[PDB]
Amino acid sequence: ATFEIVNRCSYTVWAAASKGDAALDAGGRQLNSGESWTINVEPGTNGGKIWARTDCYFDDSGSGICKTGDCGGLLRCKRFGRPPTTLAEFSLNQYGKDYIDISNIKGFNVPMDFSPTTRGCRGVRCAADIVGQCPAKLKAPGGGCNDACTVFQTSEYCCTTGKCGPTEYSRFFKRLCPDAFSYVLDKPTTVTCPGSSNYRVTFCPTA
């Protein structure tokens, strides 16, 4: 499958693509404002994620650190990123279908649209100004808005019992972005697309 990753932000993002134990395609790439990166994601991929990283410092070897979404200090991500990270999440070719969503469960850093290229399903978007509205206690020191589980590390927020409901902090994200997951047991906002669809992930969407 094809995923076009497009940076329409006024700032650079270091795009990342991983399925948690491995890179998808090259795993990461610097996208200056206006740049795009088209990757191939293998059919059958489950638990794939694409996200933006902001304010990265990499040396010539591709090692360093990002202020949001850092993946083990690498330019080319193999693992998932440090919160806060707006997440484009997908599993492909699952019983004939693809499944896509956006999640704020690990916080929000960059506004995102995640849409199919085909007409056979809809896209989803979380592009409200969550960082500008972020409650003080959730503000992340390098930018972005942490989820409450990251900040407080209690079962109320982390759902580590498999038993949790909405909170004032999940509702902060959910009201701003109803189409994104705001906590683990949120009413699902996963979209069913035709199997073997192609997609576009847009940072700072306007269309």
UniProtKB/Swiss-Prot annotation:
It comes from the Eukaryota. Coiled coil: none annotated. One of its GO terms (cellular component) is cytoplasmic vesicle. It is found in: Cytoplasmic vesicle. Gene3D superfamilies: Thaumatin. SUPFAM superfamilies: Osmotin, thaumatin-like protein. Disulfide bonds join C9-C204, C56-C66, C71-C77, C121-C193, C126-C177, C134-C145, C149-C158, C159-C164. Keywords: Cytoplasmic vesicle, Disulfide bond, Signal, Taste-modifying protein. SMART domains: THN. Taste-modifying protein; intensely sweet-tasting. It is 100000 times sweeter than sucrose on a molar basis. Belongs to the thaumatin family. This is Thaumatin I. It comes from Thaumatococcus daniellii. The lineage of its organism: Eukaryota, Viridiplantae, Streptophyta, Embryophyta, Tracheophyta.
